[PDB]
Amino acid sequence: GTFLFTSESVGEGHPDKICDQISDAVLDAHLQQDPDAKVACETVAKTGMILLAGEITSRAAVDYQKVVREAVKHIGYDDSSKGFDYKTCNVLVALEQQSPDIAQGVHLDRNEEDIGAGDQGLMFGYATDETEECMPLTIVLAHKLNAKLAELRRNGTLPWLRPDSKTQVTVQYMQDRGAVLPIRVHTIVISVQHDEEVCLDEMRDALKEKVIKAVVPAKYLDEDTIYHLQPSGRFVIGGPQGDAGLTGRKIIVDTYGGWGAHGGGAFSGKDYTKVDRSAAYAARWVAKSLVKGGLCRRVLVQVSYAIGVSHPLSISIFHYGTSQKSERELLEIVKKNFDLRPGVIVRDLDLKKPIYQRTAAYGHFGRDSFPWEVPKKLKY
Amino acid sequence: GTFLFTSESVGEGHPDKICDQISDAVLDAHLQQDPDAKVACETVAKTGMILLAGEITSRAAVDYQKVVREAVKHIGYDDSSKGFDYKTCNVLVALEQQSPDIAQGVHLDRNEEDIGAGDQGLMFGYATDETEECMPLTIVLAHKLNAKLAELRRNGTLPWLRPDSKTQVTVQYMQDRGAVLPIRVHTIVISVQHDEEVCLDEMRDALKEKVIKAVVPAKYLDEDTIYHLQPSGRFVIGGPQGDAGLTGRKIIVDTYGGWGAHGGGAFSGKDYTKVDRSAAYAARWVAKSLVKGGLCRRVLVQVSYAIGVSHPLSISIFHYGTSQKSERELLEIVKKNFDLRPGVIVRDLDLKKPIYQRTAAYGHFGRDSFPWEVPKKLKY
Lengths: 380, 380
Ligand SMILES: C[S@@+](CC[C@H](N)C(=O)[O-])C[C@H]1O[C@@H](n2cnc3c(N)ncnc32)[C@H](O)[C@@H]1O
Ligand SMILES: C[S@@+](CC[C@H](N)C(=O)[O-])C[C@H]1O[C@@H](n2cnc3c(N)ncnc32)[C@H](O)[C@@H]1O
Ligand SMILES: CN(C)c1nc(=O)n(-c2ccccc2)c2cc(Cl)ccc12
Ligand SMILES: CN(C)c1nc(=O)n(-c2ccccc2)c2cc(Cl)ccc12
Known about the structure:
The structure is a homodimer.
Chain A lengths: L2 E8 L4 H19 L4 E9 L2 E9 L6 H12 L2 E2 L4 E2 L4 E7 L3 H7 L14 E8 L8 H18 L6 E16 L2 E16 L5 H16 L10 E4 L9 H4 L2 E2 L28 H18 L5 E8 L8 E5 L8 H11 L4 H8 L6 H4 L21
Parallel strand pairs in A: 3-6, 9-10
Antiparallel strand pairs in A: 1-8, 2-3, 2-11, 4-5, 7-12, 8-9, 12-13
Helix pairs in contact in A: 1-2, 4-5, 7-9
The complex binds S-adenosylmethionine (SAM) (2 copies) and 7-chloranyl-4-(dimethylamino)-1-phenyl-quinazolin-2-one (TQB) (2 copies).
């Protein structure tokens, strides 16, 4: 019954993640002034350039130059020696109003609770009892390794670190009637941008001793664990200079690390009317409520929408064999306890609040007791 | 045992799909002259703009203006009345060479068979016996509905159609020991950009009679099937003008429609050394070989890599309960029959051939007998 599973994560300075954070900094800036802002902000990053492209209709007065540059500063790209500098990069803006055709079909002259979905699409929520936070251990560990790198960079412990990083964790699991049980860490990859002075052996030693050992419990590591630390051998060029980034290109890092399922929609840069985000957060909330409610050890929920239509077109459940209840029974419990219209999700999950930039690195789920992470007490 | 499942697809003029097609037109243009071109071409589209951003190291001499404009022309955006025109749009280029740090760690001075993976990451392949092409019926039907729209647009049957479209199909299934059996179509959504003259009732009637009935077998449609046709009510503004597009923002449309799993990587604009594409194609090839070989009715395969390392770090199998063989036995059969090093996949799947633009709409899988769609005869 043993098997392997792998997930990855990326750091705050990974170029795709820079774009997600900037998109969400823009969304938050709008929501701070106009809780009803309609935002669809894509970000593109390449050497010396942040471009904003998309559609925003809002009563806010937002200084895009300042918002973008402050987000880049926070990430840590503050000098040309690091390959990118918030003070001196180009910020280009190609933002128009929301299409009036979309606006009239989705939200104009609609009661909020009865607002239409902002697009068609499908979304999934997942939860697993293998960790207290109801997330896969593979992706939890991968995120924590990137967070540790940023911590040691920011506290000056490892001053040769730069913001761009990737990690990948392969766990060996056992299974019991569909639930999964972590046994050990089989393989770890860490790649992180670094300065010109540090040598490879110094980096590899620090990554094992100060990063991996500070994150992964020793009980999971043994003489057979495989370590791929700085496997490319050199990573001085990094950030947008090494690889163009775009918003919504880390959707699996943002969610479940390959476990569960994904409908394809990106989260960052979108207000609540874009069900790609709000309905995925609500589906996570449902899945976590089913697991924390003791109805199943792990579960997947699908929901779907049509643009302009408030109620979901479909809802589906897969319990992996981890419930005594059938999937039909669990679906009835979901329908009795949740209303997945976007105009109701916004109220339940407080989705006009400007907390989105906080979600845009280290995963949207399993952290910080956001509203979608607080289970609903189920009645049945 | 009945349940619903939903998948979507988009047309050739959907702005994200425009970007995937342009990225792959650029890749093909390079490969026509330099089979060993290193290409990582992202495309961004917004009103009046195509921007290319990324990294290319190649001996080819490519005229980006011509390649981009010809791709847009093929899609059908050829007049300002349609919201976008290949003749007069802005084409901006922000392309640099591949990072020398990546090049030295991946492929420089390496035997081709022993080339390293171009990045870390995880990838999945999936196959299901529910259709001859081994794809989910939900996504097959969703793709065919977009193809039908483009066909009726191009043949002048429905001259009010424009290139930007989305479709979504919810199928009601039964199941038998993990295999899935389509019963009926529960809901169909179609949204398509249109001219200023056609009325809503004319469009809805044509979408039902000339599009849906021409694609979906009557046996799946009944008096209870729900139709959401032009549900926003008006879709005159479309293409990049209505919504900014980016390469790699339709990764679920490109693959399995929510079924199976996804590792997060985008396909378009990347040469074979980027395992996001090559290893996902090889994983599809493995999954389809297991199903067509009669070892299982449906199956999911995971593979993962570290940048600079040729052999996969992990391989995993999930057979949904549809094989008499254990997943451990199926994994041994896979390891005996396949070599998923990128430098071997390139040879098996002929991945230097410039056929990539053909993959960039209507899904990468289940069509045209590409090499990854031709099962391998298994020995065990
Ligand atoms: C390897 S790059 C993708 C391929 C790249 N666009 C190319 O031109 O080959 C993807 C990510 O890997 C990381 N990366 C960049 N340079 C790297 C290096 N020298 N070694 C390891 N990882 C690197 C960065 O996080 C980057 O965003
Ligand atoms: C609805 S838009 C995404 C949200 C949009 N960025 C906004 O500002 O609200 C996503 C896709 O839906 C389609 N679309 C655009 N305008 C539409 C309309 N008026 N009705 C229906 N679908 C539309 C296009 O395929 C577009 O790429
Ligand atoms: C318990 N177990 C053996 C697995 N559980 C799973 O949830 N999936 C999985 C993941 C995503 C989508 C669908 C299934 C697996 C997938 C693979 Cl490739 C291997 C093992 C598993
Ligand atoms: C047979 N059956 C009931 C389903 N089969 C599946 O493959 N998945 C599924 C899809 C992606 C990832 C993991 C599982 C389902 C998922 C849902 Cl939400 C509902 C039903 C199913």
